[PDB]
Design a protein around this nucleic acid. Structure first.
Lengths: 37, 145, 215, 58, 175
RNA sequence: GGGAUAAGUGCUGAAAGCAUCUAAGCAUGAAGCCCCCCUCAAGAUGAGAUUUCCCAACUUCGGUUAUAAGAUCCCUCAAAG
RNA sequence: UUGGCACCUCGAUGUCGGCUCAUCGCAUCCUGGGGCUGUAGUCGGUCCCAAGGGUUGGGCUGUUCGCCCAUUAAAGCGGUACGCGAGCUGGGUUCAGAACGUCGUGAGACAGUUCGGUCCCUAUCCGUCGUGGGCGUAGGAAAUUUGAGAGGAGCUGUCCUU
RNA sequence: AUAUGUUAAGUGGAAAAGGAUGUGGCGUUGCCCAGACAAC
């Protein structure tokens, strides 16, 4: 998990969602998972 | 010509009321009750004597909040010992001791004088639908809102 | 096992089988009787009330605590018993046993039982300095002038006051102390004593209050 | 103090102090706040008649 | 809500009784009920049920597809039922039944005992394949996840409990 | 040891015919939070509870007496100071 | 932190380091829980949650700081008048003596070395640690108690089995 | 208190470059039932 103020898609399969009022992304490879903070 | 009526202790007649805190919002019930503990709803209201009535709040475990207030409405209580600050959320304070929740909310709307302290001693909050004071013969009040 | 009162006699030693030395305290617990019994319907909680050792009967012009007075006489007579010196309540016991007026005998405990003992520690007068709080001395030498005083008490400006927990001289004294997880070494029914492994709070001939261990 | 007492007396006829004074002005009545509250204390019927006129002028 | 408007809800020998707030479902394995919603009302043409949403609010059109799906899952579970099967991979890793309860051997210094719950049926095939049968989809999924979280798959050799059709990313880390 | 949580992990699940830990719901999860353990505590002026003991006349009840249960002054002391 | 400014104090807010005694923040040194790994195992790297407790003896220097010797689970960084001299010391430096280098025609000077060099106060108020007398608690007493609240405690190594 | 609306953050009741399917208002222009917009 990367925690950075700038969250962006790195994949072409990466997806942006909101959970509990926080922006995140999710790909199958766990390196690309991020959340805003 | 100085002619204004002032109330004495040999003039005042206090009566008893019963409020139902069921489906009401804290604060909005509290301000209306606070105005009754003082004689504000009376002619012959005199500010240096106590001229208000007794109130009884009955259900008081059915009181309501609007926002997310039940999880973050901390209360905070210091104790005068180094690092002695304590804490409880509003949600868990009406789950245990709902009577102190409402009593403290209403007393915070009364003056902190020798007379405000005595006026706040007429409150009688209960949790549940019954109370012991049948001998005082209280009426229902039906908040205005 | 559940609860009993006694007096502290002193310390000795005992050789356990396998020949090891065991330091031991002699507690004498005679004349334990169940007085009033409290219930949740009458009082709000369950407990039994025990009286330890009997004093003399009511006398018309008594002037010490050696003779019972009228209210104590009546209370101790409601259960057919003589007046007692010490009276305590036990909440850990089962209240459905213990008829009122029973005698609590010393063999309610058995060798090997783990117990907790509660006494009043013993009496040290105004001692305060490095004896009360286990503090360090200043140097005894080079130029000192600072030996057994306390240090600084607080800071400057920011705290223009001391604080509520500051440790200062003021009588060691006689608090209530519980020692946990001791053990019964041997019970002596004819002399009515219990041998407890270790040492317990208080001076000789003080009250001890044995209970079964909570842990 | 007088305004507090008049406000208390007007809520018993389902008016607030604000609208009662507005209506009394539109009716032309020129009684003090000091007299208006001595009437409300001693003579309730007269105060009721004042309130009806204040209500009719609105 | 396409799924909300596409409310077929074709029943079976299962009878569908309404109690206004909640709904109860009886069938071959039924008698399970759930509290659905307040602002949404139903209508049963002959046997089939259809849902209707008021005021077209986004809250309404979001609760629409959910209330339509919960009834479908709760009536289709009593009819047919739900199953989730998961497989054990690794040397010496074995699990077998203790009647209704289940104990597992997955390389710890102690076996793991997971006692059963109501409306659930464990059954081991060959000391390496475990399936869970039930009528509640959510409860079946919950238990299937809980027994899996005892030893999840590791990426170097794949050993650990695994869903029957789960793809497992495998790494190649050489000494 | 129990209860509720953090980061995290989830189940079911729409909005958005797919997907998705979340928006309705349902779990789990830290030597940290609340209890559990030890001591003080009704001046808690909101002054709580239980058991037992004691109960008077004068009188202008203005108070005067004498007292009850129970204490104390004084004296011999220490396990207390 | 080194500075910029000159707003309180020049009919005095009087001192670096050490000692005694603490108390708070978290931007976490150890111990607890996790994600990713260029994580095979044992070890690590990086990030997220977390302030309950813990966080060493010496040699050299007045030294803060620093280097070194042995340990330890670990030897965290900061605020508190760079916490604390009406609680202590007085090694250092802004006092009178003396000497060296250097500068000065000289009396002298440096901020450069070196040896010597007086540390006052009986606690009134708040604060804090102990310990009593008075009244109150709708009769007066003796004993046993509930617990609203408050304080205390809270660490961690090695070895053996699997 | 009378009307209309916005906010779900206790924002209101202390801050930036940047980041983001949070939700209103307003336009221009694409693909529209001859079948897109996805799933299979």
């Amino acid at each position: 998990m990367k925690v950075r103020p700038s969250v962006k898609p790195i994949c072409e399969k990466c997806k942006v969602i909101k959970r509990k009022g926080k922006v995140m992304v999710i790909c199958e490879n766990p390196k690309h998972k991020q959340r805003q903070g | 010509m100085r002619q204004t009526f002032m109330a004495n202790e040999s003039n005042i007649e206090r009566k008893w009321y019963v409020i139902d805190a069921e489906g009401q919002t804290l604060g909005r019930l509290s301000s209306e009750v606070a105005s009754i503990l003082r004689g504000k709803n009376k002619v012959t209201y005199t500010p240096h004597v106590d001229t208000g009535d007794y109130v009884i709040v009955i259900n008081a475990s059915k009181i309501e909040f609007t926002g997310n207030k039940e999880t973050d409405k901390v209360y905070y209580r210091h104790s005068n010992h180094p690092g002695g600050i304590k804490s409880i959320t509003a949600g868990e304070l009406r789950r245990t001791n709902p009577e102190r929740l409402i009593e403290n909310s209403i007393k915070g709307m009364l003056p902190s004088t020798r007379l405000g302290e005595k006026q706040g001693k007429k409150l009688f909050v209960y949790g549940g639908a019954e109370h012991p004071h049948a001998a005082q013969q209280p009426e229902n009040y039906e908040l205005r809102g | 096992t559940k609860g009993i009162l006694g007096r502290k006699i002193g310390m000795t030693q005992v050789f356990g089988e396998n020949g090891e030395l065991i330091p031991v305290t002699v507690v004498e617990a005679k004349e334990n009787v169940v007085l009033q019994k409290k219930t949740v319907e009458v009082d709000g909680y369950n407990a039994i009330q025990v009286g330890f050792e009997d004093k003399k009967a009511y006398k018309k012009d008594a002037k010490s605590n050696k003779y019972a007075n009228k209210p104590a006489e009546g209370h101790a007579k409601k259960a057919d018993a003589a007046p007692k010196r010490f009276i305590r309540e036990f909440r850990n016991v089962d209240v459905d046993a213990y008829e009122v007026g029973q005698e609590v005998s010393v063999d309610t405990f058995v060798a090997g039982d783990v117990i907790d003992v509660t006494g009043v520690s013993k009496g040290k007068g105004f001692q305060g300095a490095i004896k009360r709080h286990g503090q360090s001395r200043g140097p005894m030498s080079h130029g000192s002038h600072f030996h057994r005083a306390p240090g600084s008490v607080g800071m400057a400006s920011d705290a223009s006051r001391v604080f509520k927990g500051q440790k200062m001289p003021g009588r060691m004294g006689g608090n209530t102390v519980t020692v946990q997880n001791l053990e019964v070494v041997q019970v002596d029914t004819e002399n009515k004593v219990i041998l407890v492994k270790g040492n317990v709070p208080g001076p000789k001939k003080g009250l001890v209050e044995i209970r079964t261990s909570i842990k | 103090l007088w305004i507090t007492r008049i406000n208390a007396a007007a809520r018993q006829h389902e008016m607030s102090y604000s609208r009662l004074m507005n209506g009394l002005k539109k009716a032309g009545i020129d009684i003090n706040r000091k007299m208006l509250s001595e009437i409300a204390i001693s003579d309730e019927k007269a105060f009721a008649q004042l309130v009806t006129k204040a209500k009719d002028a609105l | 809500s396409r799924v909300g408007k596409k409310i077929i809800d074709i029943p079976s020998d299962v009878t569908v009784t309404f109690d206004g707030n909640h709904v109860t479902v009886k069938g071959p394995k039924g008698e399970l009920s759930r509290t659905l919603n307040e602002r949404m009302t139903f209508k049963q043409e002959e046997n089939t049920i259809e849902v209707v949403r008021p005021s077209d609010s986004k809250e309404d059109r979001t609760n629409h597809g959910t209330t339509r799906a919960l009834l479908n899952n709760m009536v289709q579970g009593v009819s047919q039922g739900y199953v989730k099967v998961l497989e054990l991979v690794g040397v010496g890793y074995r699990a077998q039944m203790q009647g209704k309860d289940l104990i597992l051997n997955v390389g710890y210094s102690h076996p793991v005992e997971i006692k059963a719950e109501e409306n659930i049926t464990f059954s081991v095939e060959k000391n390496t394949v475990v399936k869970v049968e039930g009528i509640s989809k959510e409860q079946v999924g919950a238990l299937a996840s809980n027994i899996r979280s005892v030893r999840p798959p590791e990426p170097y050799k794949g050993k650990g409990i695994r869903y029957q059709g789960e793809y497992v990313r495998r790494k190649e880390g050489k000494t």
